[PDB]
Ligand binder design. Structure first.
Ligand SMILES: O=C(O)CNC(=O)C(=O)O
Ligand SMILES: [Cl-]
Ligand SMILES: [Mn+2]
Length: 332
């Protein structure tokens, strides 16, 4: 079974998403609470379905709210095409008071459980090509999601954050989710209208603590980097809460939950600190076009888009983690 290791030997990378024997290798990492990466998923999909132009053409007239990733401001009652038309074409992006193009995220779209209903062909294309299908598919035999009683697909679409100032901002702030999930990068858009940003992208992953083999995927492989993830083991979540309670009190704090508050992005400062002061070393992961990231239930994580990303995630409930999922459901 074709695979290799990233993050200095600590992250499994599976290279063939439809290899039936994948579970054997996957499960050993997964039962220890490690995330897992599967590359090559884009090569299985119907490309034409996962274009920003197609999303604009087909659903542009819908009403939506957006989020400015730099200041968290909400842009109320805008149109879907406003987002998608500026995904790669910088001059088409909605502008702040100062007339500058904004780095934006599309909020709650599609809304509710409307994905399957709103996008049936995309739904079938994703689900027919998810890796580890017995775990990940709604009706997969190791997916307990639908098999349990009432006590246990989402898009993440946003532009990139490339500046030096941007490096301490999250596309999605540190949080955890209650079930297992797989997050697939189905499209990476390289924006035009400000010239090349390759060196900023590279300095951002380096400062994000990415390993040398991850960086060869750019230098040698010439792969298109989508997003930079930091993921932590579910067990390490309290040690991370402890750090953030303290740091927060150093600007005026309650015995509350910083991870649930989803207000923190761990920059290179706090990550060195979390490691030396709490022993906690996470996984710095660059998600390229076609990479599927498996995030264990309750494993805290944050995301920082480098370029413009179309991501689609499927939740599931594995036997290995079904106790976590139960315990996380009650606390949440
Ligand atoms: O992609 C993002 O911005 C955030 N993704 C997730 O939080 C996830 O898959 O759980
Ligand atoms: Cl499987
Ligand atoms: Mn998440």
């Amino acid at each position: 079974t074709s695979h290799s290791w990233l993050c200095d030997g600590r992250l499994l990378c599976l290279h063939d998403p439809s290899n039936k024997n994948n579970w054997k290798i996957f499960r050993e990492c997964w039962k220890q609470g490690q995330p897992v990466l599967v590359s090559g998923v884009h090569k299985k999909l119907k490309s034409e379905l996962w274009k920003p132009e197609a999303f604009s053409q087909e659903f542009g007239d819908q009403d939506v709210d957006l989020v400015n990733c730099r200041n968290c401001a909400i842009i109320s009652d805008v149109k879907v095409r406003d987002f998608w038309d500026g995904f790669e074409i910088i001059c088409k992006r909605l502008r702040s008071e100062d007339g500058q193009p904004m780095v934006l995220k599309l909020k709650d779209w599609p809304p509710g459980e409307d994905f399957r209903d709103m996008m049936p062909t995309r739904f079938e294309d994703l689900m027919e090509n998810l890796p580890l299908p017995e775990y990940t598919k709604r009706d997969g035999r190791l997916n307990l999601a639908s098999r349990l009683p009432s006590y246990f697909p989402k898009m993440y679409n946003a532009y990139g954050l490339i500046t030096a100032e941007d490096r301490r901002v999250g596309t999605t702030n540190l949080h955890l989710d209650v079930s297992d999930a797989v997050n697939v990068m189905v499209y990476v858009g390289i924006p035009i209208g400000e010239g090349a940003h390759d060196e900023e992208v590279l300095k951002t992953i380096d400062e994000g603590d990415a390993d040398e083999v991850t960086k060869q995927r750019i230098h040698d492989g010439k792969e298109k980097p989508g997003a930079l993830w930091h993921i932590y083991a579910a067990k390490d979540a309290e040690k991370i809460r402890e750090l953030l309670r303290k740091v927060g009190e150093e600007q005026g704090q309650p015995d509350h939950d910083p991870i649930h508050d989803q207000s923190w992005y761990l920059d290179q400062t706090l990550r060195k600190r979390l490691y030396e002061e709490y022993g906690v070393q996470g996984w710095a992961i660059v998600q390229f076009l076609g990479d599927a990231v498996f995030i264990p239930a309750g494993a805290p994580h944050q995301v920082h888009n480098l370029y413009s990303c179309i991501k689609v995630a499927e939740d599931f409930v594995s036997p290995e983690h079904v106790k976590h999922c139960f315990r996380l459901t009650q606390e949440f």
